[PDB]
């Protein structure tokens with residue numbers, strides 16, 4: 001629920017009617033298929049909040 | 057507020073309860089069905105006044 005947006009260097013996800021940038025994560029997003037299908041896709045890390053917890 | 061037309065249609069799919077990726081993965085098909093459908097409007101109104 002949101003839109004992907006860049007400030008010119010980083011990528012964030014925001015709600016559509018008020019600028020509120022969040023880090024892109026495995027909660028803020030959902031997967032569907034491989035990178036090759038979508039017209040105009042871009043490359044970024046998506047942060048997974050479990051991985052630093054599995055680091056302990 | 058400007059927005060790319062493929063993303064405006066993703067919001068409009070998401071508003072009828074069809075998930076956004078149904079557009080982005082079918083975008084050429086959805087554009088072809090749309091361009092074809094407007095071609096039938098043009099033909100119908102040329103073919104009859106009724």
Ligand SMILES: *[C@@H]1O[C@H](CO)[C@@H](O[C@@H]2O[C@H](CO)[C@@H](O)[C@H](O)[C@H]2NC(C)=O)[C@H](O)[C@H]1NC(C)=O
Pocket residue numbers: 007008009010
């Ligand atoms: C875009 O977002 C980033 C991340 O919030 C802003 O933060 C700085 O990013 C630069 C690299 O581009 C880092 O060297 C700085 O250390 C960051 N500063 C902070 C406070 O985190 C960045 O300023 C934003 N604006 C632009 C035009 O990139």
Ligand SMILES: *[C@@H]1O[C@H](CO)[C@@H](O[C@@H]2O[C@H](CO)[C@@H](O)[C@H](O)[C@H]2NC(C)=O)[C@H](O)[C@H]1NC(C)=O
Pocket residue numbers: 043
């Ligand atoms: C986005 O990331 C992908 C994955 O790293 C990039 O695809 C690879 O790009 C390298 C360098 O051109 C090629 O050697 C590989 O063969 C590519 N792999 C595939 C499966 O195509 C992609 O180029 C990146 N795109 C952008 C615009 O940065």
Ligand SMILES: *[C@@H]1O[C@H](CO)[C@@H](O[C@@H]2O[C@H](CO)[C@@H](O)[C@H](O)[C@H]2NC(C)=O)[C@H](O)[C@H]1NC(C)=O
Pocket residue numbers: 084085088089
């Ligand atoms: C969904 O319906 C569309 C037509 O409404 C089908 O699209 C056609 O697909 C064939 C190949 O399978 C092409 O030769 C046609 O040119 C396509 N039509 C258009 C307008 O692009 C599509 O195959 C159907 N998909 C499924 C899964 O049933």
Ligand SMILES: *[C@@H]1O[C@H](CO)[C@@H](O)[C@H](O)[C@H]1NC(C)=O
Pocket residue numbers: 039040041
């Ligand atoms: C945007 O349009 C330009 C032509 O104006 C094209 O070269 C480019 O590949 C397009 N990029 C995306 C992300 O659709």
